[PDB]
Amino acid sequence: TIKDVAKRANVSTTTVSHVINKTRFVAEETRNAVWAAIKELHYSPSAVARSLKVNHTKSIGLLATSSEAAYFAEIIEAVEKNCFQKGYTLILGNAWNNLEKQRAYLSMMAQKRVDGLLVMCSEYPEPLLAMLEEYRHIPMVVMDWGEAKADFTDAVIDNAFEGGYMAGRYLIERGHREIGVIPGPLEANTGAGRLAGFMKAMEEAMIKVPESWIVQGDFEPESGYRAMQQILSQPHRPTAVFCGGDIMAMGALCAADEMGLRVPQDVSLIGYDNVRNARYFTPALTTIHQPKDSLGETAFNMLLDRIVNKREEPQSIEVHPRLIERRSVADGPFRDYR
Amino acid sequence: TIKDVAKRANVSTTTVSHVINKTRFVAEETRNAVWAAIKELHYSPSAVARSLKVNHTKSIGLLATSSEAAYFAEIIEAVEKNCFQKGYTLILGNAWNNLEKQRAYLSMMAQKRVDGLLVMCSEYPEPLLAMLEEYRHIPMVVMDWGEAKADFTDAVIDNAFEGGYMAGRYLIERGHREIGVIPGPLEANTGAGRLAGFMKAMEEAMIKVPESWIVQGDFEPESGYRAMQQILSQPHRPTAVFCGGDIMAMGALCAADEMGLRVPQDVSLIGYDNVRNARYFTPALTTIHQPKDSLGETAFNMLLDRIVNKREEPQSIEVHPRLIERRSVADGPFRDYR
DNA sequence: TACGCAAACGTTTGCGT
DNA sequence: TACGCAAACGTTTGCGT
Numbered sequence: 001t002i003k004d005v006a007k008r009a010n011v012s013t014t015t016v017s018h019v020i021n022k023t024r025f026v027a028e029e030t031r032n033a034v035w036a037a038i039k040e041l042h043y044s045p046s047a048v049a050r051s052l053k054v055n056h057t058k059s060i061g062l063l064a065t066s067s068e069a070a071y072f073a074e075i076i077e078a079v080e081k082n083c084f085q086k087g088y089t090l091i092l093g094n095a096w097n098n099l100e101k102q103r104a105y106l107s108m109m110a111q112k113r114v115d116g117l118l119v120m121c122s123e124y125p126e127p128l129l130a131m132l133e134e135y136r137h138i139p140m141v142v143m144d145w146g147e148a149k150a151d152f153t154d155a156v157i158d159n160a161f162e163g164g165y166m167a168g169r170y171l172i173e174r175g176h177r178e179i180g181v182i183p184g185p186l187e188a189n190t191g192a193g194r195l196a197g198f199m200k201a202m203e204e205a206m207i208k209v210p211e212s213w214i215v216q217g218d219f220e221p222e223s224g225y226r227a228m229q230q231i232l233s234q235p236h237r238p239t240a241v242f243c244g245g246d247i248m249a250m251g252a253l254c255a256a257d258e259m260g261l262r263v264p265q266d267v268s269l270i271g272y273d274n275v276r277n278a279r280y281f282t283p284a285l286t287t288i289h290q291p292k293d294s295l296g297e298t299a300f301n302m303l304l305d306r307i308v309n310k311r312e313e314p315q316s317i318e319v320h321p322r323l324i325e326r327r328s329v330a331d332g333p334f335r336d337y338r
Numbered sequence: 339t340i341k342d343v344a345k346r347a348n349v350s351t352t353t354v355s356h357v358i359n360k361t362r363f364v365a366e367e368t369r370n371a372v373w374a375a376i377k378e379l380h381y382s383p384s385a386v387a388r389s390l391k392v393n394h395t396k397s398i399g400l401l402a403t404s405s406e407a408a409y410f411a412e413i414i415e416a417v418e419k420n421c422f423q424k425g426y427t428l429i430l431g432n433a434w435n436n437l438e439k440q441r442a443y444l445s446m447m448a449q450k451r452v453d454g455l456l457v458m459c460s461e462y463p464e465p466l467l468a469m470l471e472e473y474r475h476i477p478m479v480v481m482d483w484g485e486a487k488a489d490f491t492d493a494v495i496d497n498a499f500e501g502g503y504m505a506g507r508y509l510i511e512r513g514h515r516e517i518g519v520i521p522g523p524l525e526a527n528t529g530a531g532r533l534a535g536f537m538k539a540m541e542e543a544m545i546k547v548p549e550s551w552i553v554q555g556d557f558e559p560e561s562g563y564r565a566m567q568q569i570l571s572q573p574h575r576p577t578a579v580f581c582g583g584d585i586m587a588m589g590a591l592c593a594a595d596e597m598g599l600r601v602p603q604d605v606s607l608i609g610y611d612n613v614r615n616a617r618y619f620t621p622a623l624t625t626i627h628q629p630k631d632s633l634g635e636t637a638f639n640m641l642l643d644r645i646v647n648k649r650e651e652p653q654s655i656e657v658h659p660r661l662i663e664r665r666s667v668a669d670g671p672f673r674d675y676r
Numbered sequence: 677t678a679c680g681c682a683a684a685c686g687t688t689t690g691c692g693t
Numbered sequence: 694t695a696c697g698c699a700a701a702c703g704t705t706t707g708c709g710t
């Protein structure tokens with residue numbers, strides 16, 4: 001079809017190609033004609049032909065876990081924005097934590113020859129780490145590790161641990177000593193790490209978390225629902241709860257309300273993530289905010305680097321969580337005694 | 339690189355290609371060797387080379403509005419699932435209702451030669467309809483029109499109007515006669531259409547909606563916040579409110595609570611969409627459910643058709659909303675008198 | 677039997693002059 | 694000056710025998 005353009009214009013396809021890509025000077029007259037042709041002929045330059053030669057698709061692959069989750073969903077929108085402003089095309093892939101599925105998308109991806117890979121799989125078993133390595137040749141960054149599990153990738157790190165600690169400290173400083181916790185999956189960083197950061201501050205204040213007071217969630221609202229329930233559904237109950245993720249907290253809030261408990265009046269609750277509409281939870285959610293937009297742009301940027309400035313060395317950037325006081329926490333029994 | 343495989347194997351690339359695609363019988367011995375080579379050499383068959391010849395990318399483009407919105411986000415996850423099971427790759431694009439951006443993604447798309455196009459732009463001005471047509475050659479379906487605006491596309495239709503009517507009828511049948519409404523953008527179907535379906539049932543019952551009682555939203559929680567506020571912030575206030583979308587309702591719920599109003603005790607509220615976690619709103623949201631998973635798979639299926647069975651004729655499939663009784667509505671003053 | 681040779685897909689880019 | 698000829702990117706697929 002470039003041939004068809006070249007001819008309506010009576011110039012070489014070499015010419016057409018030069019004007020289309022402004023890769024060398026061309027007589028105005030010449031240029032104009034080409035355009036004209038380009039027009040009537042209604043021409044769409046084929047990227048597949050072009051990638052074939054130039055050796056890059058100008059497309060990036062996001063191997064995510066799920067895209068419905070508020071959390072994820074906001075990161076993704078971030079990455080896309082960046083791709084679109086620097087000309088990259090985004091191929092989105094949800095593997096749902098299924099190895100098979102993962103082996104599958106990873107491969108469809110190498111085959112489509114994406115220029116780089118954005119990895120966000122939540123959990124990383126050796127079997128997965130292993131697969132990841134087989135594509136070390138394709139540039140990539142894992143946006144969700146705690147530390148740097150590997151040497152064949154870039155990593156953006158969230159300091160989930162320090163978020164966990166911040167959360168606990170707030171509770172402590174508000175007068176709370178009987179606290180509970182619904183962590184997210186321990187196999188995940190945002191799960192295990194947030195919890196641990198939380199457990200430290202407790203030890204620091206000699207608070208002890210009765211196991212009957214910690215209930216695993218899975219970042220889904222229903223998990224929050226059940227957890228809270230189970231917590232308050234007991235003889236002795238905490239006065240404050242740390243919830244591993246906003247959406248689960250949303251669930252925690254519903255159950256309380258359903259048991260006729262008042263928040264923060266009966267139970268104080270603090271979450272984590274600061275999802276776009278946590279401010280509109282009822283009551284307005286007090287949480288630890290995770291820089292999602294920056295977590296995304298930061299990742300996109302390391303990749304581009306590696307892509308463009310052909311980097312070889314693994315890199316890692318830290319990002320920082322911060323506390324957001326809203327209205328779901330109230331002073332606890334010891335506020336006055338400090 | 340296929341050449342490199344062919345040689346480690348001492349067979350023709352024609353052979354390699356045949357075994358890789360099982361396109362003709364090959365001696366086990368032969369086959370095996372090829373694999374062997376395929377292995378050590380660590381081979382990734384290039385899809386770009388292949389698409390170049392076979393003429394299809396086996397990739398589909400979703401030109402959406404935004405992917406953060408709960409609503410959207412759930413549809414998208416649906417479409418992706420379908421793509422992944424039928425081998426298609428999903429290229430996601432958010433145009434945010436910006437023509438320019440739209441002209442941009444549309445073009446990057448034709449150029450990447452996607453096999454088909456999934457359109458979900460919320461609002462369709464002639465200028466946009468116009469652009470869309472210039473790509474009538476690429477197969478596509480618009481998943482969000484009310485009626486069939488064009489002849490050069492497939493359309494999946496939601497019956498938003500009948501959702502609107504259902505909503506109103508419920509309110510009426512619960513004893514409500516003083517109702518308010520926060521519609522979504524009138525330029526959009528889910529906006530204008532839901533409202534109109536709602537206005538009909540009103541006329542039918544001779545209920546009259548005082549303009550001071552209808553406040554436009556934009557599907558975003560803050561719009562709900564402000565609207566509700568403005569509604570209840572007045573001398574005379576309705577006893578029930580129809581909210582154009584769940585997320586806005588979420589906002590409506592927050593404000594009420596903030597003015598110390600009780601739901602549904604002081605104000606009854608009913609939304610629309612039945613987003614994944616409306617059940618966990620406080621209180622559990624009563625809403626009209628939009629079949630999102632089916633809205634997605636249905637769209638993917640018309641496209642595949644057109645793609646595969648090379649259809650030419652425009653088609654349209656209707657989908658149906660349905661009411662979900664949760665706990666945000668209470669009987670109104672006239673319940674007993676019917 | 678079971679497999680090869682060679683042209684083609686639509687570009688970009690080196691040398692020409 | 695301002696532009697062309699022709700080879701190459703990595704495949705698939707028609708005919709061969």
Ligand SMILES: Nc1ncnc2[nH]cnc12
Binds near residue numbers: 071122188190219
């Ligand atoms: N895996 C996860 N899923 C959903 N929200 C999250 N927030 C932090 N980690 C998350």
Ligand SMILES: Nc1ncnc2[nH]cnc12
Binds near residue numbers: 409410526528529
């Ligand atoms: N345009 C839109 N945005 C967000 N949620 C919606 N639900 C219905 N239409 C919507």
